[PDB]
Amino acid sequence: DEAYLEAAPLAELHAPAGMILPVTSGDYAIPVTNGSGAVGKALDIRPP
Amino acid sequence: IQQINIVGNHAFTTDELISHFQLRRKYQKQKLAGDLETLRSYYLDRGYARFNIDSTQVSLTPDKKGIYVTVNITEGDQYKLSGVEVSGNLAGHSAEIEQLTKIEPGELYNGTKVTKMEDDIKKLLGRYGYAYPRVQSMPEINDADKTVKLRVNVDAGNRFYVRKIRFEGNDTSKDAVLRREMRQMEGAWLGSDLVDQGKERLNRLGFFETVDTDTQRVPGSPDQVDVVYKVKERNTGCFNFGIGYGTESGVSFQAGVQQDNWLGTGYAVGINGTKNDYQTYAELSVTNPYFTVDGVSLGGRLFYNDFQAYTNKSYGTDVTLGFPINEYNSLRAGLGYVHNSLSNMQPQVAMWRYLYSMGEHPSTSDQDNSFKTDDFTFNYGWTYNKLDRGYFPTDGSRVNLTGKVTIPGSDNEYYKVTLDTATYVPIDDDHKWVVLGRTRWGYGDGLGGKEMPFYENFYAGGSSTVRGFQSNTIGPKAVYFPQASNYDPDDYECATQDGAKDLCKSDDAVGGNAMAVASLEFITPTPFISDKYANSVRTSFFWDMGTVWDTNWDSSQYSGYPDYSDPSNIRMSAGIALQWMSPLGPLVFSYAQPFKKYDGDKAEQFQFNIGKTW
Amino acid sequence: PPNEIYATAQQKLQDGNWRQAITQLEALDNRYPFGPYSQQVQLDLIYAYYKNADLPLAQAAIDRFIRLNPTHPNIDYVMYMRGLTNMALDDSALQGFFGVDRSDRDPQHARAAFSDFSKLVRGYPNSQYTTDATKRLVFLKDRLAKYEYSVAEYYTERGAWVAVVNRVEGMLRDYPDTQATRDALPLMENAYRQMQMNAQAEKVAKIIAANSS
Amino acid sequence: LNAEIRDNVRFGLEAVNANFRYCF
Amino acid sequence: VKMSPLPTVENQFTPTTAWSTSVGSGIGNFYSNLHPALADNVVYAADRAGLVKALNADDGKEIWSVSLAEEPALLSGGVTVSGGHVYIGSEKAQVYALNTSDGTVAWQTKVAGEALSRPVVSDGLVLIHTSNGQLQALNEADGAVKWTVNLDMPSLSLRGESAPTTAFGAAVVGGDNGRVSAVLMEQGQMIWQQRISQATGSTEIDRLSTPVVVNGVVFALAYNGNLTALDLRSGQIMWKRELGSVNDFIVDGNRIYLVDQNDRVMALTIDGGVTLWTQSDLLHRLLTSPVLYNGNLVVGDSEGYLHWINVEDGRFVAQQKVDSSGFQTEPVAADGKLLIQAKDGTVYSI
Amino acid sequence: LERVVYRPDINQGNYLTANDVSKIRVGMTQQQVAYALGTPLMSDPFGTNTWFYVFRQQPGHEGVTQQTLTLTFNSSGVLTNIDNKPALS
CATH class of the missing domain: 3.10.20.310 (membrane protein fhac)
Known part of the structure; x- marks a missing residue:
C-alpha cells in the first residue's frame, strides 16, 4: 500500500538553553536528497 | 563383529563389562571410543585411580569375513x-x-x-x-x-548484569505477551535460577513449539550480557462454517470460531452456534488471562439453547474472576444464573421423585405438563500446574477442583463438586517412555431435604472419559411409567396407554449422582514415526475403568429391576490410541474393546474426535 | 526452445497469470541455464516472486543473482527490490483488516529492510528510486521507534524503573527526531520521580518544556 | 463437490453438506 | 559373488581313509591355527573348550585326556611338541607347558598378549608371537622370559600374524608392517630389518600373514604382492617377484609351490620369479595351505574336499570329500600318515 | 484488598555492599572505580560525568528497600564527590 507516504514529518529537538542531549550515533542517518523521482503507484517496478 | 576380547582383568568378568558396550557390527567400529569411555567410567566409578587403557586393536578376518576387537586393560587397586x-x-x-x-x-x-x-x-x-x-x-x-x-x-569471577532482553520470534503475538512471563527484570543482576523460569513459562502458555534460551556477551564491556529468546509460533485455533440446508431440514446452519490466542493479544475466545428446525444453540465465551499487570484473570460466558419434543429450553450467564496465590497454585470464584423450562415430559420414577420433593404433583401417566425454574448459583475452584508442555506433557502433575453451590432464594437447592487430576512420570532419560495416570471424581447432593435436579446429573463414557463405550452409556437406565401419548396410532410401547401396562426397564440413560473414572496409559515412541511426526503425534497404550451410581436410589420399592445403589459395578475396557497434532489441532484416533461389561451396556470399539482436551 | 518460452513468459507478464509466467521462466532457466536470456529471465523471476508473494524464493533468487553479478548496470534495481521484499515480511492481512497496531511485533525484518535501503541510498545517490527510498526510510524509522516506546510503557507499568530509564535513553540516541521520543519523555520524568532523583527530573522537565507544542 | 485450497483452508459443497474450515 | 568350480576330477588311486575320530566341537566359525600335532606315534589335539587329548597315531584311539577349563579356556595357537614338552597358547595371554608322557600342566605363564600363532621351540627357547606386536622369548623349563622385542602395530588385520622360524641361532620374524627382521636368540638383539612391500592403501591393503630358510636364503612373501628371496646375514634381497598371499607355501625340489589370494595354485622355480605352471580349477573356493604328501600336493577347501595335485605340471590327480563342514587349517603328514582335522572337532586320518 | 495477590520479587539497580562502598576514595580514577564496583547502570545522558548507583529491592508484599550512591567526576576523569542516600524519605 501507499500508507508509508502518510508518515508524519520529522523534526529535530533543541536543548533548554544550557544543557545538551547525548551525542547521537551514526546509525539510522538519512541523507538529504533532491526528491526528483516518482513515488508510490507512479513508479515502474518492472525489470528494465 | 564376531568377538571382543577384554584382557587383563581380575576383579570383573568380561560378560558384565561388555554388557555396557554399544557394539556387540561391521562398519560400526567407529563407535568403539564410546565404549572405552564407558570402561573409564566403570572403573573410575569404583575408585581405580590408576586405571587406564594401554592399547586397543581391531582387525579383519581373512576375506573380510568378520572383525576381532581386543582391549588391553591395566587394572589397579581401589583408593x-x-x-x-x-x-x-x-x-x-x-x-x-x-x-x-x-x-x-x-x-x-x-x-x-x-x-x-x-x-x-x-x-x-x-x-x-x-x-x-x-x-x-x-x-x-x-x-x-x-x-x-x-x-x-x-x-567465582565477576557479577553480571542484564542490559537488554530481546526477542526474535514474535511474528503475530504482542511483545508484552512474552515480557509478562519473564521473572528476570532488566537492569538487575543475573540469576541462572531466575532466567531458567522463562523457558518453562513460555511453554506453559501453549503458544510455542520451542523455546531456545541464550546468553551473549556485550563486546564493549567485561561484565554485561544480553538474554535472547527464540520462539516459533504454533498455529492455534480455527474458524468453522457449515450449511445444513435440505428438503427435510429446511434452512439451517452451524458455525463458530475458537482460539486460545486471539489475533495474538492473549485473550481467549469461543463463539459457537447452530440453528435448525428442531433445536437452537448459541454460546459466547471470552476471557482475559491478564486483567491487571499482576496476573489477575477475568472472563465469562453467555449461552442459550432450546430443544423441541420432550420440549425444553435454557439460557444463562457465568462471570468468573480468578487469581494466583503462589507461583504454582491459583483460585477461581464467580457468579452466574440459569433459566430452565421443561414441557411434555415422559413420566419417570427419578423425575417424579424430584418433582415430589420440589412440591410438584404431576398427574400420573400424563404428558400434558410443564415446569420452570430460575436458579442463581455461586461457582468456585482451585488449580495446580507444574507441567512442562502445553500439549504433550513429559513431567509434573495437574489438579483441577471445581464446584457450585446454589444461592438461597433460588428454586433449586444443591451443591456439586468435581475433581480432575492427572500425573506424568517419566521412565526414560530421553522422555520417550512415560507413564500417565488420569483420574476423575464427582459427587453432589441437595440441601434442605430436597433432591438434586435431574438435568445436572453426571454422565460418563465416551472418548473423552472412558474409551470404547458410547457417550452417556455408562450408568443407571430410565424406568418409565405405564398414558396420554399422541403417538399411540403408530413408538415406545411403555409410554402409550394402549401397550403400556406395567413398569418397564429401558436403555435410556438418566445419569447419576456420583461418578469415578480412572485410567493408566503408557506413552511410547514407535519405529513408524518420522521427524515430521515425532514432534506432533503421540502413540500410547491404555487401560480404562469407571463407575457411575445413583445416590438416593431406593431399591426397596422396585424388586424386579436392577438395584442402582451398588457403586461396585465398575465397567472396564482397554486399548490403543494415537494423538495427532494436525494442522487442525490435536485429533484423537482410538480403538478399544470392553472386557468387563454389565447388562444394558452399549459398545463402540472405535472412536474418533478432534481432541483439544486432556 | 528459449524463444517460445520467453515469448510466452512475456505475454503472461504483460497481461496474464503470475504462476504461468513463473512456470515458463522456470522451464527456461531449467533448460537453458547459461544463455543470454538469463540477464532478464532471472530478474523476471525475482520480480515474479515479488508479485506472487513467494518471498523466500525472491530472496534466494536475489542472492544468487548478486553472487553471479558482483557489478551490473542495474544492480541497484535488485537492491531496491530486496528492500521491498523485506518490508513485505512485516505485515499480514489479519493485522491490517482489524486495525491492529503492529509496532509490538518483533522488528527483525524492519531492521533488515532499513539496512538495505540505507545501502541503496548511500551507494547510488543519483538513483531514480531515491524519492521512494527516502519515504520508506522515514516510515521505517518511526516503525522502530514505536517498538521501543511500547516496551518502555510495559516496564513503567511493571515498575522496572531502571529498565525504563535505559530504554528511553536508547530512544534518545537512536531516534532523536521522531514522535515516539516526544511522547516517551514524560515516562522518563515519571520514572525519575519514583526514585529520589529530583535533580535529574528537573532536567527532563526542562527538555519537555523547551520542545512543547 | 469439495476442494483443498490452502494449508488450514478447506472448502466444499458436498440436500447439501457444504462447509468451510479455516485455521490460523 | 564368485563361482565355486566343481571340476570332474577322478579320485585316482582312491586314497584310503584309515579312520575318523573327534574331540570336542571344533574351531568352527572362529579363525585360528589350533592345529593337531603328531609326535612319537601320538596325535595331540584340543578344542576351545580346554579339552586336550592324546590319541594313538596308528588307529585313532584316545589314550589320554585333560580338561584345562573350569569361563572357558578359549585355547588357540595350536599345539607345539618338542622333546619332552608340549606348549599351547591362549587368547588370555596364558601359555601352558604340558609334558609328552602325561599332558598334565608342568607350568603356565602370562605373556601379556594373545597367543595367536603357533608357538615354536628352539634350543631351550620357546618363541611366542603376540597379537600386540611383542615377540617374547620364554624359558622352556619354567616360563621365565629371557628377552622381548617389539614391532610397530598398524590398525590393519589379524591374519594369524605369522609365527617366527629359526636359523643358525637367530629368529626369523616379521609382521603386519610389511617388514621382516632377524633377532639374535641369545640376547633378543635385532640383527637387521627389511621392507618387503609398500602400499598406498594404508587403510585398505594388508601387509603380512611364514618365512622359511632354505640353504641360508630367506624366502617369504607379503600379502601385498611381494614374494622375495633374501640373504640371512642382512636384509639383502636376492630376487623378488610381485606375488603375495596369506597362507604358507611349500618349498621342495628346488621348486616353490604357492597359493594365491584368490586360491590360484602356482608352481615357480627356486632360482627366480619364474612360473612353472598354474591351476585355476579350485579358484575362488577358499583353500587351506597345501602339504606335500607322497610326492603329490594335497590341498583342501571350505566345502570338505581334499585334492591331490601332480607336482610336475599341476595336473589334478584326485579329489575326495571327507567332511561336509570344511577345513580351515593346513593338513600335516609324517611317516606315511596323512592327518587333518576338519573345521569341526572331527579329526580324519588317511 | 490487593495484599493477597502473589507478586514476584522485583530487583532494580546494581548490587551494592558496604564492604565495597568503604573502598571508594576521592582521587580514584574512573577505571579504578568501575573495577572496584562494576559498570554503572545509570548515568546522566544530558550532562556531566556523573554516575549513579541505585540498589533497589521489592520483596513480594514487603516495602521498598533502597540505597543510592552518587559520584561526581570532573572532565579530567578524576572523582570529585561522593554522596550517599542510605534510606528513602
Whole structure:
C-alpha cells in the first residue's frame, strides 16, 4: 500500500538553553536528497 | 563383529563389562571410543585411580569375513578419599561450598561424584550472578596407603548484569505477551535460577513449539550480557462454517470460531452456534488471562439453547474472576444464573421423585405438563500446574477442583463438586517412555431435604472419559411409567396407554449422582514415526475403568429391576490410541474393546474426535 | 526452445497469470541455464516472486543473482527490490483488516529492510528510486521507534524503573527526531520521580518544556 | 463437490453438506 | 559373488581313509591355527573348550585326556611338541607347558598378549608371537622370559600374524608392517630389518600373514604382492617377484609351490620369479595351505574336499570329500600318515 | 484488598555492599572505580560525568528497600564527590 507516504514529518529537538542531549550515533542517518523521482503507484517496478 | 576380547582383568568378568558396550557390527567400529569411555567410567566409578587403557586393536578376518576387537586393560587397586580441600576466591560462599562438599570419610572414590561436585559449585554460584566461574579440580594420590585427596581451584569471577532482553520470534503475538512471563527484570543482576523460569513459562502458555534460551556477551564491556529468546509460533485455533440446508431440514446452519490466542493479544475466545428446525444453540465465551499487570484473570460466558419434543429450553450467564496465590497454585470464584423450562415430559420414577420433593404433583401417566425454574448459583475452584508442555506433557502433575453451590432464594437447592487430576512420570532419560495416570471424581447432593435436579446429573463414557463405550452409556437406565401419548396410532410401547401396562426397564440413560473414572496409559515412541511426526503425534497404550451410581436410589420399592445403589459395578475396557497434532489441532484416533461389561451396556470399539482436551 | 518460452513468459507478464509466467521462466532457466536470456529471465523471476508473494524464493533468487553479478548496470534495481521484499515480511492481512497496531511485533525484518535501503541510498545517490527510498526510510524509522516506546510503557507499568530509564535513553540516541521520543519523555520524568532523583527530573522537565507544542 | 485450497483452508459443497474450515 | 568350480576330477588311486575320530566341537566359525600335532606315534589335539587329548597315531584311539577349563579356556595357537614338552597358547595371554608322557600342566605363564600363532621351540627357547606386536622369548623349563622385542602395530588385520622360524641361532620374524627382521636368540638383539612391500592403501591393503630358510636364503612373501628371496646375514634381497598371499607355501625340489589370494595354485622355480605352471580349477573356493604328501600336493577347501595335485605340471590327480563342514587349517603328514582335522572337532586320518 | 495477590520479587539497580562502598576514595580514577564496583547502570545522558548507583529491592508484599550512591567526576576523569542516600524519605 501507499500508507508509508502518510508518515508524519520529522523534526529535530533543541536543548533548554544550557544543557545538551547525548551525542547521537551514526546509525539510522538519512541523507538529504533532491526528491526528483516518482513515488508510490507512479513508479515502474518492472525489470528494465 | 564376531568377538571382543577384554584382557587383563581380575576383579570383573568380561560378560558384565561388555554388557555396557554399544557394539556387540561391521562398519560400526567407529563407535568403539564410546565404549572405552564407558570402561573409564566403570572403573573410575569404583575408585581405580590408576586405571587406564594401554592399547586397543581391531582387525579383519581373512576375506573380510568378520572383525576381532581386543582391549588391553591395566587394572589397579581401589583408593579411598581422605577429604576435600577447597581454596580460592570463594567470595563469601564458603559455607555453601563446604556443605556441598561434605563426604563420609572412607567412601570409595568416584570420578563422577567429583564431576558432580564441580557442576554443583558452578550451579550454586550462578544463583548470585557469577555467570562465568572458573573452577578446576584434580586428585592427589598417595600410593603408600591407596589414598586420594581432592583439590578444587574455585574462582567465582565477576557479577553480571542484564542490559537488554530481546526477542526474535514474535511474528503475530504482542511483545508484552512474552515480557509478562519473564521473572528476570532488566537492569538487575543475573540469576541462572531466575532466567531458567522463562523457558518453562513460555511453554506453559501453549503458544510455542520451542523455546531456545541464550546468553551473549556485550563486546564493549567485561561484565554485561544480553538474554535472547527464540520462539516459533504454533498455529492455534480455527474458524468453522457449515450449511445444513435440505428438503427435510429446511434452512439451517452451524458455525463458530475458537482460539486460545486471539489475533495474538492473549485473550481467549469461543463463539459457537447452530440453528435448525428442531433445536437452537448459541454460546459466547471470552476471557482475559491478564486483567491487571499482576496476573489477575477475568472472563465469562453467555449461552442459550432450546430443544423441541420432550420440549425444553435454557439460557444463562457465568462471570468468573480468578487469581494466583503462589507461583504454582491459583483460585477461581464467580457468579452466574440459569433459566430452565421443561414441557411434555415422559413420566419417570427419578423425575417424579424430584418433582415430589420440589412440591410438584404431576398427574400420573400424563404428558400434558410443564415446569420452570430460575436458579442463581455461586461457582468456585482451585488449580495446580507444574507441567512442562502445553500439549504433550513429559513431567509434573495437574489438579483441577471445581464446584457450585446454589444461592438461597433460588428454586433449586444443591451443591456439586468435581475433581480432575492427572500425573506424568517419566521412565526414560530421553522422555520417550512415560507413564500417565488420569483420574476423575464427582459427587453432589441437595440441601434442605430436597433432591438434586435431574438435568445436572453426571454422565460418563465416551472418548473423552472412558474409551470404547458410547457417550452417556455408562450408568443407571430410565424406568418409565405405564398414558396420554399422541403417538399411540403408530413408538415406545411403555409410554402409550394402549401397550403400556406395567413398569418397564429401558436403555435410556438418566445419569447419576456420583461418578469415578480412572485410567493408566503408557506413552511410547514407535519405529513408524518420522521427524515430521515425532514432534506432533503421540502413540500410547491404555487401560480404562469407571463407575457411575445413583445416590438416593431406593431399591426397596422396585424388586424386579436392577438395584442402582451398588457403586461396585465398575465397567472396564482397554486399548490403543494415537494423538495427532494436525494442522487442525490435536485429533484423537482410538480403538478399544470392553472386557468387563454389565447388562444394558452399549459398545463402540472405535472412536474418533478432534481432541483439544486432556 | 528459449524463444517460445520467453515469448510466452512475456505475454503472461504483460497481461496474464503470475504462476504461468513463473512456470515458463522456470522451464527456461531449467533448460537453458547459461544463455543470454538469463540477464532478464532471472530478474523476471525475482520480480515474479515479488508479485506472487513467494518471498523466500525472491530472496534466494536475489542472492544468487548478486553472487553471479558482483557489478551490473542495474544492480541497484535488485537492491531496491530486496528492500521491498523485506518490508513485505512485516505485515499480514489479519493485522491490517482489524486495525491492529503492529509496532509490538518483533522488528527483525524492519531492521533488515532499513539496512538495505540505507545501502541503496548511500551507494547510488543519483538513483531514480531515491524519492521512494527516502519515504520508506522515514516510515521505517518511526516503525522502530514505536517498538521501543511500547516496551518502555510495559516496564513503567511493571515498575522496572531502571529498565525504563535505559530504554528511553536508547530512544534518545537512536531516534532523536521522531514522535515516539516526544511522547516517551514524560515516562522518563515519571520514572525519575519514583526514585529520589529530583535533580535529574528537573532536567527532563526542562527538555519537555523547551520542545512543547 | 469439495476442494483443498490452502494449508488450514478447506472448502466444499458436498440436500447439501457444504462447509468451510479455516485455521490460523 | 564368485563361482565355486566343481571340476570332474577322478579320485585316482582312491586314497584310503584309515579312520575318523573327534574331540570336542571344533574351531568352527572362529579363525585360528589350533592345529593337531603328531609326535612319537601320538596325535595331540584340543578344542576351545580346554579339552586336550592324546590319541594313538596308528588307529585313532584316545589314550589320554585333560580338561584345562573350569569361563572357558578359549585355547588357540595350536599345539607345539618338542622333546619332552608340549606348549599351547591362549587368547588370555596364558601359555601352558604340558609334558609328552602325561599332558598334565608342568607350568603356565602370562605373556601379556594373545597367543595367536603357533608357538615354536628352539634350543631351550620357546618363541611366542603376540597379537600386540611383542615377540617374547620364554624359558622352556619354567616360563621365565629371557628377552622381548617389539614391532610397530598398524590398525590393519589379524591374519594369524605369522609365527617366527629359526636359523643358525637367530629368529626369523616379521609382521603386519610389511617388514621382516632377524633377532639374535641369545640376547633378543635385532640383527637387521627389511621392507618387503609398500602400499598406498594404508587403510585398505594388508601387509603380512611364514618365512622359511632354505640353504641360508630367506624366502617369504607379503600379502601385498611381494614374494622375495633374501640373504640371512642382512636384509639383502636376492630376487623378488610381485606375488603375495596369506597362507604358507611349500618349498621342495628346488621348486616353490604357492597359493594365491584368490586360491590360484602356482608352481615357480627356486632360482627366480619364474612360473612353472598354474591351476585355476579350485579358484575362488577358499583353500587351506597345501602339504606335500607322497610326492603329490594335497590341498583342501571350505566345502570338505581334499585334492591331490601332480607336482610336475599341476595336473589334478584326485579329489575326495571327507567332511561336509570344511577345513580351515593346513593338513600335516609324517611317516606315511596323512592327518587333518576338519573345521569341526572331527579329526580324519588317511 | 490487593495484599493477597502473589507478586514476584522485583530487583532494580546494581548490587551494592558496604564492604565495597568503604573502598571508594576521592582521587580514584574512573577505571579504578568501575573495577572496584562494576559498570554503572545509570548515568546522566544530558550532562556531566556523573554516575549513579541505585540498589533497589521489592520483596513480594514487603516495602521498598533502597540505597543510592552518587559520584561526581570532573572532565579530567578524576572523582570529585561522593554522596550517599542510605534510606528513602
